[PDB]
Amino acid sequence: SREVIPLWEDKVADGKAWSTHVYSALDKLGPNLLDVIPADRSLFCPKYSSLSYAQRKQYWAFVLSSMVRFESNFKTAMSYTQDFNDSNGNRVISRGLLQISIESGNAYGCGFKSTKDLHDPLQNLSCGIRILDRWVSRDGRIAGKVDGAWKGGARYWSVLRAGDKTSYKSIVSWSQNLSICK
């Protein structure tokens, strides 16, 4: 049985299927994410190095759900226009559960064929996994600004950037107080 259940199982009717998908997608798209022992585990998850593969998948599904909470409050339809342009000269639009944009997402190999695909929560979560798989494994840590540079998931998501704000403080607190982490 699972020891940790993601927050979207409490909030959305389809949350259990989101979890099922995320566990599968972590296997396939997050093999590097699941192999990292992050340098900021003492902050996010003190017992991380003791976690089994299955427990790491439960951990990451939970953390993803906390990011979704603060990026979109679990609203897959969310569409927020940013100030900057993309390669066509149109303003970037952040979409879906993790507020990813199509040009940036596709650079990670997410293969969104249409803007509508980012509003598919499963595709959106898979892309989030690809982004974490890239940066957490490259940088060897979950977040933080180290020697002038944002690292891990904080390269992409504001909610993972340390500051005196509700999103970051909640994500860190909820993570470090998971029974498997503490």
Numbering used by the authors: 73 to 254
Sentences reproduced from the published study:
We solve the structure of family member Bd0314 (that we named DslA), revealing adaptations to the lysozyme fold that sterically restrict the active-site cleft into only accepting polymers deacetylated at the GlcNAc positions.
The fold is comprised of seven major α-helices (A-G), several smaller 310 helices, an elongated β-hairpin (b1–2) and a smaller β-hairpin (b3-4). The net effect creates a bulge and allows the sidechain of E154 to face upward, directly across from E143. All four of our DslA structures (two wild-type, E143Q, E154Q) are highly similar, other than a relatively small flexation of the β1–2 hairpin in the E154Q variant. Variants E143Q and E154Q clearly fold and retain a similar active-site architecture (as judged by our high-resolution structures herein), but display no notable activity (middle), confirming their participation in catalysis. Residue E143 of the conserved ES motif would act as a general acid, protonating the equatorial linkage between MurNAc and GlcN, with E154 acting as a general base to activate water to attack the MurNAc C1 in an axial orientation.
